[PDB]
Each structure stands twice: as structure tokens, then as C-alpha cells.
RNA sequence: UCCAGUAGGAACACUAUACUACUGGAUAAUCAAAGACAAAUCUGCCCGAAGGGCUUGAGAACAUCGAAACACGAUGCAGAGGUGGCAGCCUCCGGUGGGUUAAAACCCAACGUUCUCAACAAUAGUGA
């Protein structure tokens, strides 16, 4: 029915000067009716490409798109300090239109380990009626990292969520933080509460725990 | 240039309300080209959503939105709007609007974007939020360095700020994005890195705002 | 209407004449620009008694353009050879994006109006 663009990857980390390349696929025939838009945090799009290939006016020549059957790439010859930034493809060909997921394009480092810091819930918020229990991943890199609950050793599930920092503008690390959250009777009931992290920068899984009281 | 788009119409609404949303357009005759709203949901990614057709003002819809909403242009106000009803959570969003090229100029491109309107669709209140310190144990310390912070909880509208001593101390700290609960309200906390030493002899007090209820917290964090 | 340059001139080729198109001009019709059927006769299936359209004209789709994705209007101006049809592949031409650059010289990539109908495919000369 809808045509559909697929957008790859979703993430992807360059240096400056390094020549990035985001790629689309086209579920169906487009013919060259695509666009790609470059995005930052809170603020308007910007058209980059036309009609598959066709450089926008006002655009560094830098940037540049081509077709090849129903697969769309664009282009950056020469990765700028601006062009850190999230990019999408655009379909017009047909209605509905759509856009591929967006590809984020991040700052490339050395790896670095998480710190793993965690932080039982506070008696002042007890006496309220819920308990939140925070584990911090800090300071670490590439993003991809993994948080498990474990209370008295049971795999928590759905019942916990999780925000991340934007790399650093210091040291373009990320910092990570996942939130739990139980009945003042369920915390009360449990003694041992972990969470597991696995990072690359880690060479096994790190456990930070603690026992209520 | 002188082409230019500003939205406007975006607030809270309750579920299953009903919102308007308008487009002025400067810079140019609204009817020669063609409209469109898009949206991105809080860390999401576009969304097209509607658009209009000049001369023949034909009308087109996306899946999720079709049915609910309506789009529309008055040439004497060279505006354009949405008619969004029926809003559900699920619509909450950032609204632009954006004009498609000249054929000729920058084919089917949409080159000129609003800044953009927050449509909020939430059944909750304006409640200020809860502070909570993160004290700083043994288990929140490694080598010379143990992290602290306070959770921000169960608060609504954004947007929070949050600073440590005034704002004297800003090296190595981290607020992180607030976060949906599923209570309704949000939550999020800041935390800051410091030196074993200090715990003893320095202070440590994170500044909370909240203008939408003109709430004002200051908590002490210190280990427990 | 005419002149010139060029490309065509349409059942196999070639030339001449008619005739066509683009470009510039006006009987001193300039100087120009432009100029794709070069090479090669490929692969699989199906059909005919015999396969070979740089021709027009009309209807559909589709595309380009008109401030224009549909609707409304105008235009079909670039695709070519590999012999009917379908599918594929190779080459040429074209603009486009990228590469290499003094340079689209050369390299890479995808991409480029089809279908249906009728009429016309000449007169002549020379030849497969
Ligand atoms: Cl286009
Ligand atoms: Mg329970
Ligand atoms: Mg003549
Ligand atoms: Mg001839
Ligand atoms: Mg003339
Ligand atoms: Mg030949
Ligand atoms: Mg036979
Ligand atoms: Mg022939
Ligand atoms: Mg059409
Ligand atoms: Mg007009
Ligand atoms: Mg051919
Ligand atoms: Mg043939
Ligand atoms: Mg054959
Ligand atoms: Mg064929
Ligand atoms: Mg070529
Ligand atoms: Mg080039
Ligand atoms: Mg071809
Ligand atoms: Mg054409």
C-alpha cells in the first residue's frame, strides 16, 4: 500500500573530515522524488537534497545525493563541526508521504567504560508511598549499553525506564541513567537490589548493589 | 529572506479535546504552493502528517491522523490550519508547518519550516515536583570520586531547571532528559561527580525551578 | 515565401528530386551555433505465411511545463543499434550524481515515453 523508507543506520559516528554516507531504500519505485533534511536538537529542518540529487541552493557542495534504482544515498565529502546533526530521507513521489527513521550522526572517541554508581531510595520518599531506585551509567562511550534490574536475583521487566545525556561538548562521552520503580510494599518486601551493566568498554557485565538498610 | 512561517495554537488539551492550529505565512502568496504539517514526537523522528494542494486544494492525510484532522488555507489571511480532533496522548507532539518548493526551484522539497508549535495531550495538572536527595553512599563511589544528585519527581508541564550552589559548581554534572511516567507526570534527576575529600567538609545543594507552578525547591543531598 | 548550415528523405542499401526538423538569417540572406543508427549483430522463452518505420495524424497511459504530485491547461521537444513479441545483456548518445582533474579526457552509478489505430513509406536511377 504505503510506500515505505527505510533509513540506515540509525546511528553512526564520524570525525571531522571523515566522508559520511546515509543510505535509504525505497520499498517501491520513487523514482527520484526524495529529499534529505538535516535536523538539530529543537529546531526546524533543512532541506539539503531535491528531487534525489539536486544540491539546495544555499547548501555547502559538500553534501550530495544520488540515486541508484530505488536506493538513495547522501553524501558529506568532508565531515564539518556543524554537520553534527541528524538526517533524514523523504519521499514525495506518492501520498502518504513518509520519512526514513533518521540517521543520528555523532561524534567519534576512543571507547570508554561506564562508571556504575547506584542509589537506593531515599527515606524522605518512602514515607511518601513509592520508591525509585537509580542506577547511573557515567561518563562512558560508544552510546550502545545495556541496564537489567535484579531484585533478590528476579530479572525486573517493564517496571523501570531510562534517559540519556547528548555527548559531552567536553569529552563526548555519554551519561546514562535508569530508574526503578516499586510499591513502598514491594521494596519493603525485598532485600538485595542490583542492576547488571554491560558495556564495550567493559570485559564482563558490571553488578552495583545494595540491601535495604 | 523574506519567506517565512510562523504557527501558532499549540497548548494542553485533554484526551479526545480538540485543538487548532494555524500557519501564518509571510513572504509570499500562500496559494501557489503547497502546505504541510509534520510532526516529531518527544524523541522521535518526523511525521508527515497533512497537506494541501494549491489551485485545486485537494486534500491529503496520513494513516494515523486521518479522519481526526483537517487541514485548510484562507487565502484573504494566507494562513493555514489544522483542525485536529479527537486528540489522543499519543498526538503529543511538535507541530511545523512547511511550504513544498517552486518545481522549478527545489522540486518536491520542502524548503521552508516553521519554528514550530507544542501540542501537549495530557488528562493530568499542573502539580510541582518532589525533590529527593541521591545521597552519596559507598556504593555510589569510585577511586577519589563519588557521584551525588537529587531526583526530580512526578512534576508536570515542562520544562525543569535544576542547579547546584547557586550555580557555582557546574563542572561534571549531568541533568538528564526528563522522562514520561506512566502515572502521567514526569521525572528526571541531575547528578554531579565530586571528590571523596570534600563529602566532609563541602556543601552540596541542588537548586530546582519549576515556573509552571511557580515552585522553588532547594534540597540538601548528603550521605546518609 | 526565400536563402544557408545541419540532420532526416521514412518495406535492403546508396544518390538525386520532392518533402521534414532545428539554427541563423532576407535575395549582398553573413559570421555562427549545433550535429547520437559509431562498434557490434549478444542471451532465454513465445509467436508468424513472410519479422528490419530518425515519417506523419488522432485516442489511453505516463512524463515535462504552466507558481501546478491530484483536479484544469499546454507540450511530447532524446533516446539509439543489436530485425516480431516478452524478458535480459552489451554498446552508443544524453543530461544528472560521485571519483580523478587543466578537462564529463578518462572511471563509477542509476536514470531517458510507451501502448492502440489509420495513413503514408514517393518518382526515378544504381545496387544486396
Ligand atoms: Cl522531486
Ligand atoms: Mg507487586
Ligand atoms: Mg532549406
Ligand atoms: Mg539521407
Ligand atoms: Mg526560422
Ligand atoms: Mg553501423
Ligand atoms: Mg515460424
Ligand atoms: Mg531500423
Ligand atoms: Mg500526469
Ligand atoms: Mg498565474
Ligand atoms: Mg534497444
Ligand atoms: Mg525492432
Ligand atoms: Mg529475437
Ligand atoms: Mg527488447
Ligand atoms: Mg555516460
Ligand atoms: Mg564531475
Ligand atoms: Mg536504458
Ligand atoms: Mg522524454
Known amino acids: 500500500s504505503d510506500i515505505q523508507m527505510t533509513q540506515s543506520p540509525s546511528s553512526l559516528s564520524a570525525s571531522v573530515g571523515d566522508r559520511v554516507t546515509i543510505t535509504c531504500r525505497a520499498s517501491?519505485?520513487?523514482?527520484?522524488?526524495v529529499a534529505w533534511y538535516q535536523q538539530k536538537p529543537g529546531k526546524a529542518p533543512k532541506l539539503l537534497i531535491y528531487?534525489?540529487?539536486s544540491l539546495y541552493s544555499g547548501v555547502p557542495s559538500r553534501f550530495s545525493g544520488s540515486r541508484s534504482g530505488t536506493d538513495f544515498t547522501l553524501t558529506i565529502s568532508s565531515l564539518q563541526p556543524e554537520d553534527f546533526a541528524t538526517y533524514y530521507c523523504?519521499?514525495?513521489?506518492?501520498?502518504?508521504?513518509?520519512f526514513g527513521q533518521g540517521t543520528k550522526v555523532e561524534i567519534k572517541r576512543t571507547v570508554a567504560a561506564p562508571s556504575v554508581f547506584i542509589f537506593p531510595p531515599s527515606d524522605e520518599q518512602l514515607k511518601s508511598g513509592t520508591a525509585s531506585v537509580v542506577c547511573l551509567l557515567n561518563n562512558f562511550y560508544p552510546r550502545e549499553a545495556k541496564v537489567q534490574w535484579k531484585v533478590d536475583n528476579a530479572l525486573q521487566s517493564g517496571n523501570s525506564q531510562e534517559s540519556v545525556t547528548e555527548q559531552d561538548s567536553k569529552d563526548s562521552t555519554y551519561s546514562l541513567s535508569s530508574t526503578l520503580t516499586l510499591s513502598k510494599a514491594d521494596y519493603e518486601k525485598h532485600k538485595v537490589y542490583a542492576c547488571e551493566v554491560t558495556h564495550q568498554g567493559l570485559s564482563s557485565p558490571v553488578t552495583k548493589s545494595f540491601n535495604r538498610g | 529572506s523574506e519567506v517565512q512561517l510562523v504557527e501558532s495554537g499549540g497548548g494542553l488539551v485533554q484526551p479526545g479535546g480538540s485543538l487548532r492550529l494555524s500557519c501564518a505565512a509571510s513572504?509570499?502568496?500562500?496559494?501557489?504552493?503547497?502546505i504541510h504539517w509534520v510532526r516529531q514526537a518527544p524523541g522521535k523522528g518526523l511525521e508527515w502528517v497533512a497537506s494541501?494542494?494549491?489551485?485545486?486544494?485537494?486534500?491529503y492525510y496520513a494513516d494515523s491522523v486521518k479522519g481526526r484532522f483537517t487541514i485548510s488555507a484562507d487565502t484573504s489571511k494566507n494562513t493555514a490550519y489544522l483542525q485536529m480532533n479527537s486528540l489522543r496522548a499519543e498526538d503529543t507532539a511538535v507541530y511545523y508547518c512547511?511550504?513544498?518548493?517552486?518545481?522549478?526551484?527545489?522540486?518536491?522539497?520542502?524548503?521552508?519550516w516553521g519554528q514550530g508549535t507544542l501540542v501537549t495531550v495530557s488528562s493530568a495538572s499542573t502539580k510541582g515536583p518532589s525533590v529527593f536527595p541521591l545521597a552519596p553512599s559507598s556504593k555510589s563511589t569510585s577511586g577519589g570520586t563519588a557521584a551525588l544528585g537529587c531526583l526530580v519527581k512526578d512534576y508536570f508541564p515542562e520544562p525543569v531547571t535544576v542547579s547546584w550552589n547557586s550555580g557555582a559548581l557546574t563542572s561534571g554534572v549531568h541533568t538528564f532528559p526528563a522522562v514520561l511516567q506512566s502515572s502521567g507526570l514526569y521525572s528526571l534527576s541531575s547528578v554531579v561527580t565530586v571528590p571523596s575529600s570534600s563529602l566532609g567538609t563541602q556543601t552540596y545543594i541542588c537548586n530546582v525551578n519549576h515556573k509552571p507552578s511557580n515552585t522553588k525547591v532547594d534540597k540538601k543531598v548528603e550521605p546518609k
Open positions: 528531487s534525489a540529487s
Open positions: 512547511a511550504r513544498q518548493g517552486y518545481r522549478r526551484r527545489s522540486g518536491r522539497g520542502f524548503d521552508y
Open positions: 523523504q519521499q514525495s513521489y506518492s501520498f502518504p508521504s513518509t
Open positions: 517501491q519505485s520513487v523514482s527520484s522524488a
Open positions: 494541501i494542494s494549491p489551485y485545486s486544494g485537494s486534500t
Open positions: 513572504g509570499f502568496y500562500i496559494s501557489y504552493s503547497s
